[PDB]
Amino acid sequence: YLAESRKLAETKLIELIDSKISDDISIIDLAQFLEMMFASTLQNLPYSVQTLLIFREFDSLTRQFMGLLLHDTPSTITHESIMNFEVDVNYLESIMELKQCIELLKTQGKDYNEPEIRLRKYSRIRQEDAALLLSKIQHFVSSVEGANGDDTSVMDSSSIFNS
């Protein structure tokens, strides 16, 4: 029964601290929230299963930050904003498979191969991060400072190659 409470303990703390910090430098502050919660407090005990919660929570924060960058990206992408996603997701690649969401999207993705290679060549995350790279996020990266175009090479192959 104590094992059941330990499993449910790591479970409810996993979803708790997971969705707690679920809501650049703010993700680096979330990586500093990954410092204070995981890499300082939880690192003392778990060089184990926080190593599993490097997958079960933190690559589930690359799955969760994946789908956060893959739901529908309104205006958080540009030549600086998605370059700040390199300060978020390629900074999540600072440690070994989390180079996903800043790949093939960080440079104001609004091209045919930026959308279609945001689907087929922005991998290690889910492939919903093309419509949230060049369909919402190139009418929205085109709506962002450092615009690159609301193309149908962007929006059509981003809403088509992904979906």
Q: How far apart, in whole angstroms, are the C-alpha atoms of residue 60 and residue 118?
A: 20
Q: How many CB atoms lie within 10 A of CB 5?
A: 9
Q: How far apart, in whole angstroms, are the C-alpha atoms of residue 129 and residue 77?
A: 12
By 3-state DSSP, what share of the chain in percent is helix, strand and coil, each rounded to 5?
50, 0, 50
Residues contacting 5, CB < 8 A, separation 6+: none
Q: Exposed, middle or buried: residue 64 (CB in 10 Å: 0-12, 13-18, 19+)?
A: middle
Q: Exposed, middle or buried: residue 132 (CB in 10 Å: 0-12, 13-18, 19+)?
A: buried
Q: What technique was this entry resolved by?
A: cryo-EM
Q: How far apart, in whole angstroms, are the C-alpha atoms of residue 153 and residue 114?
A: 9
Taking the CA atoms of 12, 19, 85 and 27 in sequence, report the sign of the dihedral they define: negative
Q: How far apart, in whole angstroms, are the C-alpha atoms of residue 149 and residue 128?
A: 20
Which amino acid is it at 3? A
